[PDB]
Amino acid sequence: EFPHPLQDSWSYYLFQFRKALDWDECLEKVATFSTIEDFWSVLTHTVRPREITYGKDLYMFKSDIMPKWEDPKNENGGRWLINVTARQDVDFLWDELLMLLIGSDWDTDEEDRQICGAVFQPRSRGSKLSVWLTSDNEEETILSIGRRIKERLELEDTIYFQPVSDQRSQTRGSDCTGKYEI
């Protein structure tokens, strides 16, 4: 039962808001894993997406990449944004998404290179899953990644690619477009 090594080492974080903490101070690293076995153990020992309280978020990023815009690997990037519908199981969405990422089940090496991490954000008004990518202008690769996400997550609604600049300038509470859409 020698462990199965992953293409990358990943770190798993919880975002928990408390009063008078800066945004990044609300993040805490709860695991770093590098094997299939340890990947599944993290999920078995942390809260399921369907059980999480609103506004408490899950971040899974390649270990060398901090889960914030300020990281060199994120600052010129963007995210595929997925708006969860009432009929969808967020446990399925999150598990399929993370399997796609940690298993590196992309057609090409180049797509894997774009990947920074994934984010689950439970919200009252509609939950969101995101995949953060290192660039905002590798159109062809960004689009094949978006297409693969939709396939694996069995998504029907349009997904949106939003560069970090647009994320920064987004107002909390505004009701959704992207540089790319599919």
């Binding site: 090594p5 299939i36 298993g103 590196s104 694996r152």
Partner: peptide
């Protein structure tokens, strides 16, 4: 060589 695992295999490990 990029290390690749499909969902069938990952789930079998789960």
């Amino acid at each position: 060589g990029r290390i690749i695992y499909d969902r069938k295999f990952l789930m079998e490990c789960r």
